[PDB]
Amino acid sequence: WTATSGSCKGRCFELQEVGPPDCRCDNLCKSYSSCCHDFDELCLKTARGWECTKDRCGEVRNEENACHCSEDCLSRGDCCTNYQVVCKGESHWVDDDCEEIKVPECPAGFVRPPLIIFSVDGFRASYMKKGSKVMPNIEKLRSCGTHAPYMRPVYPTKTFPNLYTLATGLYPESHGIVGNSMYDPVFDASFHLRGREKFNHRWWGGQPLWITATKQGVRAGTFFWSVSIPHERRILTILQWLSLPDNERPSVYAFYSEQPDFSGHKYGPFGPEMTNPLREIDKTVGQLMDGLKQLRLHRCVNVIFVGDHGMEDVTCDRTEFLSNYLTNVDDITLVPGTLGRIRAKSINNSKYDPKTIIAALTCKKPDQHFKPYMKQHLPKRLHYANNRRIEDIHLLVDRRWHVARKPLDVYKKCFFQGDHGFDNKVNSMQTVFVGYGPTFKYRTKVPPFENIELYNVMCDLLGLKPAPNNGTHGSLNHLLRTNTFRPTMPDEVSRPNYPGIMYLQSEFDLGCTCDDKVENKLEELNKRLHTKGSTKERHLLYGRPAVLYRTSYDILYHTDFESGYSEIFLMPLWTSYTISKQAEVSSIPEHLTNCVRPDVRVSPGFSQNCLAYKNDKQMSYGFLFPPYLSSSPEAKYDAFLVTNMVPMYPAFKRVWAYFQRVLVKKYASERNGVNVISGPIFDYNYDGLRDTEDEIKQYVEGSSIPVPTHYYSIITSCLDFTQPADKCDGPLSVSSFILPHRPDNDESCNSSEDESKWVEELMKMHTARVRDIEHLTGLDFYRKTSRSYSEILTLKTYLHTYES
Numbered sequence: 001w002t003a004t005s006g007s008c009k010g011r012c013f014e015l016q017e018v019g020p021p022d023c024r025c026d027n028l029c030k031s032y033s034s035c036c037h038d039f040d041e042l043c044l045k046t047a048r049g050w051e052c053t054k055d056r057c058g059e060v061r062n063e064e065n066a067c068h069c070s071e072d073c074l075s076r077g078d079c080c081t082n083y084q085v086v087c088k089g090e091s092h093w094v095d096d097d098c099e100e101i102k103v104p105e106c107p108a109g110f111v112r113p114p115l116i117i118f119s120v121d122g123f124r125a126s127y128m129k130k131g132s133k134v135m136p137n138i139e140k141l142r143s144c145g146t147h148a149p150y151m152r153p154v155y156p157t158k159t160f161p162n163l164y165t166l167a168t169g170l171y172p173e174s175h176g177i178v179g180n181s182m183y184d185p186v187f188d189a190s191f192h193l194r195g196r197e198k199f200n201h202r203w204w205g206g207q208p209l210w211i212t213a214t215k216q217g218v219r220a221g222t223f224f225w226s227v228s229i230p231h232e233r234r235i236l237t238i239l240q241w242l243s244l245p246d247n248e249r250p251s252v253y254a255f256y257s258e259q260p261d262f263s264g265h266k267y268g269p270f271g272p273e274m275t276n277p278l279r280e281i282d283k284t285v286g287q288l289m290d291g292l293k294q295l296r297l298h299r300c301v302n303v304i305f306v307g308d309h310g311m312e313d314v315t316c317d318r319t320e321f322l323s324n325y326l327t328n329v330d331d332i333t334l335v336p337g338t339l340g341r342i343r344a345k346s347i348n349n350s351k352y353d354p355k356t357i358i359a360a361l362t363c364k365k366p367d368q369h370f371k372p373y374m375k376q377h378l379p380k381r382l383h384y385a386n387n388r389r390i391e392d393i394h395l396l397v398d399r400r401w402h403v404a405r406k407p408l409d410v411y412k413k414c415f416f417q418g419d420h421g422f423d424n425k426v427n428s429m430q431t432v433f434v435g436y437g438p439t440f441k442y443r444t445k446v447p448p449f450e451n452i453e454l455y456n457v458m459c460d461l462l463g464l465k466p467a468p469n470n471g472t473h474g475s476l477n478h479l480l481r482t483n484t485f486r487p488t489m490p491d492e493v494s495r496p497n498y499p500g501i502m503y504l505q506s507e508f509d510l511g512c513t514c515d516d517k518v519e520n521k522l523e524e525l526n527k528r529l530h531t532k533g534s535t536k537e538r539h540l541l542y543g544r545p546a547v548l549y550r551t552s553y554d555i556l557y558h559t560d561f562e563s564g565y566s567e568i569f570l571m572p573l574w575t576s577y578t579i580s581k582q583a584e585v586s587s588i589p590e591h592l593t594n595c596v597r598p599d600v601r602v603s604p605g606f607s608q609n610c611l612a613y614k615n616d617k618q619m620s621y622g623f624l625f626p627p628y629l630s631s632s633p634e635a636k637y638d639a640f641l642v643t644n645m646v647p648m649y650p651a652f653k654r655v656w657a658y659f660q661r662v663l664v665k666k667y668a669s670e671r672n673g674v675n676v677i678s679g680p681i682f683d684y685n686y687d688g689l690r691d692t693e694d695e696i697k698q699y700v701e702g703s704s705i706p707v708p709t710h711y712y713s714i715i716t717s718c719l720d721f722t723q724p725a726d727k728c729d730g731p732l733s734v735s736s737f738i739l740p741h742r743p744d745n746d747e748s749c750n751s752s753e754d755e756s757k758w759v760e761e762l763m764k765m766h767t768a769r770v771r772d773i774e775h776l777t778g779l780d781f782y783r784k785t786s787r788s789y790s791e792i793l794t795l796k797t798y799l800h801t802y803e804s
């Protein structure tokens with residue numbers, strides 16, 4: 001109930017919302033059906049429009065007008081944004097040459113540069129270049145401030161997940177808004193774009209920027225606007241707030257535009273009807289910048305022009321129907337569209353089975369435009385598993401396509417030409433970032449970054465301590481002139497052991513055999529030097545990874561590779577080796593095909609054994625350092641040590657052997673050498689974090705050898721590829737992957753063909769940031785380089801996307 005008999009007199013767009021049943025006058029009262037009876041009359045005036053004309057100059061103040069051109073309006077802070085241009089001979093902001101803002105130039109009483117966020121829905125990244133002719137204001141912000149070629153949204157590339165990710169710095173699995181439509185089984189409640197459940201605060205996790213500011217004494221304007229409030233009124237409200245007295249004036253604000261997303265759905269991303277929405281966005285930006293100039297704030301405020309996601313060409317005829325795949329269509333609930341989420345229609349149905357659903361959706365049609373996943377098998381870069389609102393069964397839908405349950409859902413629920421929601425590495429889903437102001441850099445282009453990183457920067461801009469989030473604080477320091485956050489490397493928690501030769505061969509009973517008894521002072525001092533680390537500078541280029549948790553492990557040196565061997569997990573946590581451009585690929589000699597050798601540096605009790613692999617009919621093994629890349633026949637025996645062995649399904653060994661035999665050499669040729677760090681990952685609860693020992697759900701049969709869920713590799717080289725990987729003087733270049741360790745290749749529909757037709761495609765889909773691997777392993781890489789730590793943090797957040 002709301003007693004709407006109160007009045008908004010003197011309360012238009014008040015900043016604290018008053019509790020029911022007293023009537024509200026804030027910018028969200030419409031959305032709650034709770035405004036006072038006179039809100040429209042007093043707070044949403046429209047008379048005479050939004051622009052001063054020559055004849056309105058010096059007028060007598062008429063309070064009925066939407067904005068004012070009278071002489072007192074600057075003091076009252078309610079001029080039309082073009083007042084000084086029309087009435088006082090001033091120029092529009094966009095017509096001024098841009099001049100470097102070296103220091104904040106603020107009116108007295110401003111304690112910090114205000115932050116104004118200008119967020120645009122569906123602003124695809126290529127609009128900045130393709131629409132530049134009709135967006136002069138936005139183009140001046142872009143070219144004179146700091147900008148990225150594009151900003152990567154989060155998956156799913158929907159509106160609410162990405163807006164709340166921007167506000168919190170969290171993956172949607174963590175902040176809880178995992179789609180535009182959700183069902184929460186603990187609540188037994190459903191979240192929808194239309195309706196009032198979405199207003200319930202239990203859906204919204206984390207701590208968004210406006211809460212972080214408020215709790216630390218930084219006042220915030222209210223970020224959200226009821227849809228019927230026109231853009232001109234939102235701009236005027238923000239400008240009016242900026243004229244408030246110092247003790248009442250907010251320091252952070254947000255404007256939101258439902259365009260160009262609204263038209264993009266109707267006409268497609270580049271339909272001829274899209275030019276006018278782009279013009280109107282720019283005009284609104286011009287009004288804000290003109291308004292800031294009037295208030296003498298255009299060289300004081302930091303402005304962020306940021307989008308939530310892009311837009312793709314999608315039509316009704318490009319729809320896949322689950323009725324063409326499933327017999328039991330009526331027993332599932334499908335969350336449809338640019339992604340698919342499937343669950344049982346009724347929890348009292350125990351004839352429901354996800355295994356048969358997935359199989360019926362797997363590689364069933366030659367041109368199939370979606371791929372089913374159990375959510376824990378989705379690429380780890382999507383970080384879309386660890387929430388009860390994310391259904392076990394997920395469909396990754398091809399760009400430009402939709403998935404629906406039945407054909408009647410599409411014509412009884414074409415009427416659209418654009419949509420979004422696809423995989424967040426898709427080019428059409430990318431969106432924009434521009435930073436403009438005293439704290440941002442001048443005329444600076446920064447590399448693409450992910451929108452999860454913005455929350456830290458916005459906290460930096462306001463002097464706030466960020467709540468715990470998924471950005472890497474300091475990775476965007478290169479965007480800022482000042483206010484940078486200078487992080488320290490995390491301290492290493494576990495220091496390694498350096499075992500020498502401590503065990504005789506006969507102490508081992510592992511069931512392993514190797515034909516290695518075929519057998520100097522020349523190359524016997526040499527092999528001693530290698531086992532003591534004499535080639536470690538070549539294969540450990542950036543220092544040893546730091547172990548950031550309490551564990552027991554050994555450093556093992558070899559001619560061709562170095563490893564950190566875990567005595568808890570009975571396998572390396574990491575294996576590091578350098579492959580130069582000139583390195584040659586050899587084969588595994590016939591007599592060494594099944595060779596596995598005890599490591600006389602590591603006790604039998606802390607070693608794997610070959611008998612377990614023999615007895616386990618499902619599990620084979622592979623090697624982290626590849627025997628194919630041994631530098632010499634004698635060095636190849638090191639690659640068969642029991643301490644270099646990891647459990648692998650035979651189906652995965654197809655992938656791994658092709659990567660080790662073919663791709664590493666190809667990358668070394670293309671990048672002028674590469675350094676490779678490979679290892680296992682255990683994430684059985686799919687939370688993105690390293691599993692403790694008591695969370696492992698599968699072992700090699702009859703043993704304590706834990707089975708990894710994933711295998712990673714970090715492949716580093718010199719950004720200036722005229723320099724070899726091991727003699728690099730400047731910035732580095734990296735690509736990484738987190739390959740799921742699966743007993744089948746059902747994910748790859750062409751896997752019965754040669755590995756040259758499908759393996760690299762699979763690896764590209766599971767590309768990863770170094771930072772993702774750090775979360776999954778508890779390791780810290782790149783500890784010893786010549787580069788600044790902030791640059792290294794940027795490198796760790798880089799994602800090689802393989803888009804064009």
Ligand SMILES: *[C@@H]1O[C@H](CO)[C@@H](O[C@@H]2O[C@H](CO)[C@@H](O[C@H]3O[C@H](CO[C@H]4O[C@H](CO)[C@@H](O)[C@H](O[C@H]5O[C@H](CO)[C@@H](O)[C@H](O)[C@@H]5O[C@H]5O[C@H](CO)[C@@H](O)[C@H](O)[C@@H]5O)[C@@H]4O)[C@@H](O)[C@H](O[C@H]4O[C@H](CO)[C@@H](O)[C@H](O)[C@@H]4O[C@H]4O[C@H](CO)[C@@H](O)[C@H](O)[C@@H]4O)[C@@H]3O)[C@H](O)[C@H]2NC(C)=O)[C@H](O)[C@H]1NC(C)=O
Nearest residue numbers: 173174175176204205206386387388468469470687688775
């Ligand atoms: C991205 O960044 C985020 C943020 O840093 C990070 O997420 C954090 O991960 C932490 C480790 O997993 C986790 O730590 C403790 O969580 C609870 C307390 O959490 C509550 O308090 C915080 C602080 O305000 C809230 O933010 C949090 O909100 C969560 O839950 C709400 C719904 O309940 C929801 O609004 C919100 O979205 C958020 O949900 C998300 O996180 C939860 C997990 O908290 C998931 O379940 C959701 O799916 C969603 O993803 C909560 O309100 C502590 O109680 C934990 O302590 C455990 O474990 C300890 C292990 O050392 C142990 O010492 C304790 O005894 C305790 O165990 C108890 O519970 C066990 C399991 O229930 C039980 O077996 C045992 O017997 C015992 O009873 C954690 O120490 C943070 O909460 C979490 N924060 C957020 C905001 O998510 C992400 O990890 C990264 N992502 C990546 C990839 O890096």
Ligand SMILES: O=C1N=C(N2CCCC2)S/C1=C\c1ccc(Oc2ccccc2)cc1
Nearest residue numbers: 117119159163166167223224225254256306
């Ligand atoms: O007024 C609004 N109407 C909205 N709608 C959603 C679809 C239907 C109407 S969202 C909205 C405002 C809003 C402003 C800022 C937000 O957080 C950010 C964004 C960028 C950077 C930092 C923080 C989040 C939301």
Ligand SMILES: [Ca+2]
Nearest residue numbers: 683689690691
């Ligand atoms: Ca885990």
Ligand SMILES: [Cl-]
Nearest residue numbers: 158179180181
């Ligand atoms: Cl959704």
Ligand SMILES: [K+]
Nearest residue numbers: 613616619620
């Ligand atoms: K086996």
Ligand code: NA
Nearest residue numbers: 745746748751
């Ligand atoms: Na297959």
Ligand SMILES: [Zn+2]
Nearest residue numbers: 122159261265
């Ligand atoms: Zn949309």
